[PDB]
Design a protein around this ligand. Structure first.
Ligand SMILES: O=C(/C=C/c1ccccc1Sc1ccc(Cl)cc1)NO
Ligand SMILES: [K+]
Ligand SMILES: [K+]
Ligand SMILES: [Zn+2]
Length: 391
């Protein structure tokens, strides 16, 4: 079955941040509006027996000091009164600037972890073949550092639960940004292979995922050659992105043979994202770069976690994730999903004006050298890890 994480309180938490506002609500109500929900098994977010059990789960990656500071940030933003020492404390964890406090910052951040932990449990016990969590995918958070409005790294904790269930996880990062927090977390782990395709250019966040004549770092220790990156120039379209990543995806699957696949599907590569860096669409006849890669990943028949992430055009993010969800049902259940090109009536119908159509409103050597580099890294990785496969 295909699982999707949601719940009444989970929705209210996911909609409580000043940055993402009610995006999660639009995504889930558009999915509802298209009658996809009866086809999906609802995965309820995880909850814990006690504060200690929560801390034990979250500090499997984050430090206790960082979790303590994040909880204290939330309590401090629930009174009107910050002191010089509390500001210094928060600064030492980068709980400032693009990662500010707000009254539910901790409850909001924990919710994604609860969602993505429960999603991995549903995969582990084989209740679901694929689980979707559109409240998750916060790939930039570090052990003791918030970064890019990511406060707790639900992806790292979910992957940790998968490996602790030989076990090998392939993580695929489709977000416009380099997935630096997941990469760094498994820098030294061969069992979790990380692959991010992203824009990277001088001064563009977070700065990593590219040349470092400089060279590509790719892991350390026993994890050498286990972190893959494909940085791409701005303006790339569905076709050129798809051909860029397609062969890399198949190659990684053949050689690594993952037990699980974790996909971050950040929607900020859309041609209509306010970033206006990539020109991907949600079209499904050329073919959406996202849908191409998801269908490929799903054709491998590996139990798979699908996460959200970036996406700052909220209706168009919903437009994409709705089609991603519909596609996942088609590929997993073998059941045709018919999606009208017009947005159905429902709660947020007015947000889809003025045309109210499901397509986003858009009129549409470097890579060959990266392919050879990445091919060599994979052979280096397979030799190091004694993996069998046909050259
Ligand atoms: O998406 C991200 C990160 C988002 C982000 C990072 C640094 C500062 C602000 C942001 S949020 C942002 C930025 C630009 C525009 Cl145009 C709209 C929103 N990674 O997954
Ligand atoms: K990415
Ligand atoms: K790794
Ligand atoms: Zn992003």
């Amino acid at each position: 079955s295909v699982g999707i994480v949601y719940g009444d309180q989970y929705r209210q938490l996911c909609c409580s941040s000043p940055k993402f506002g009610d995006r999660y609500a639009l995504v889930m109500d558009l999915i509802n509006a298209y009658k996809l929900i009866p086809e999906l098994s609802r995965v309820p977010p995880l909850q814990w027996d006690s504060p200690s059990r929560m801390y034990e789960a979250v500090t499997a990656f984050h430090s206790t000091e960082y979790v303590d500071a994040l909880k204290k940030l939330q309590m401090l933003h629930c009174e009107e009164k910050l002191t010089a020492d509390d500001e210094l404390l928060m600064d030492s964890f980068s709980l400032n600037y693009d990662c500010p406090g707000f009254p539910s910052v901790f409850d909001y951040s924990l919710a994604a972890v609860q969602g993505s932990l429960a999603a991995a449990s549903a995969l582990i016990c084989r209740h679901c073949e694929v689980v979707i969590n559109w409240g998750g995918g916060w790939h930039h958070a570090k052990r003791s550092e918030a970064s890019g409005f990511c406060y707790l790294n639900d992806i790292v904790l979910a992957i940790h639960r998968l490996v602790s269930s030989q076990t090998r996880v392939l993580y695929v990062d489709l977000d416009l940004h380099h997935g630096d927090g997941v990469e760094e977390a498994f820098w030294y782990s061969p069992r979790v292979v990380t692959f991010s395709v992203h824009h990277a250019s001088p001064g563009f966040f977070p700065g990593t995922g590219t040349w470092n004549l400089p060279i590509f770092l790719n892991g350390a220790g026993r994890g050498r050659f286990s972190a893959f990156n494909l940085p791409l120039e701005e303006g790339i379209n569905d076709l050129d992105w798809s051909n860029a990543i397609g062969p890399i995806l198949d190659s990684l699957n053949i050689v690594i043979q993952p037990s699980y696949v974790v996909v971050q599907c950040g929607a900020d590569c859309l041609a209509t994202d306010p970033h206006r860096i990539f020109r991907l669409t949600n079209f499904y006849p050329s073919l959406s770069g996202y849908l191409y890669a998801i269908k490929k990943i799903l054709s491998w028949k590996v139990p798979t976690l699908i996460l959200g992430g970036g996406g700052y055009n909220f209706p168009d993010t919903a437009r994409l994730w709705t089609r991603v969800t519909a596609l996942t049902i088609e590929e997993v259940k073998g059941k045709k999903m018919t999606i009208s090109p017009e947005i159905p009536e429902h709660s947020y119908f007015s947000r889809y004006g003025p045309d109210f159509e499901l397509d986003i409103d858009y009129f549409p050597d470097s890579i060959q050298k990266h392919h050879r580099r990445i091919l060599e890294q994979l052979r280096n990785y397979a030799d190091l890890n004694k993996l069998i496969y046909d050259y």
